[PDB]
Amino acid sequence: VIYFVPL
Amino acid sequence: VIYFVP
Amino acid sequence: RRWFHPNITGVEAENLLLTRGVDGSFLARPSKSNPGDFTLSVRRNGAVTHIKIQNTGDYYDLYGGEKFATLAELVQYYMEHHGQLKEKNGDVIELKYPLN
Structure with a gap:
């Protein structure tokens, strides 16, 4: 699964 | 806004 | 909810969004990597993006x-x-x- 995380 | 990256 | 799914994994959420969802479909679920916490699983362009939700206890x-x-x-x-x-x-x- 691909998580996106804030910048 | 919030920007995201993998 | 009913966007809230208390008993699914990220995998199971992927399978659901891919088979019964369209682009822009989403759900929240419990987080595997942070027990007790939640994660958004969001479909866009025929794929699923996961994003963690922080619960600080104050917000x-x-x-x-x-x-x-x-x-x-x-x-x-x-x-x-x-x-x-x-x-x-x-x-x-x-x-x-x-x-x-």
Whole structure:
């Protein structure tokens, strides 16, 4: 699964 | 806004 | 909810969004990598993006951005305010259609 995380 | 990256 | 799915994994959420969802479909679920916490699983372009929701005990947020008292207020806010979640480059991650 691909998580996106804030910048 | 919030920007995201993998 | 019913965008809230208390008993699914990230995998199981992927399978659901891919088979019964459309682009803009999303759900919230319990987080594997942070027990007790929640994660948004969002379909866009025929694939699924996961995004963790932080619960500090004092508010929820997305490890950034506006603070909310409840998970449902968080979800409502990002359903109502389109284009607040983006890739750095620069397409939006939209919570359009709850997957119930």
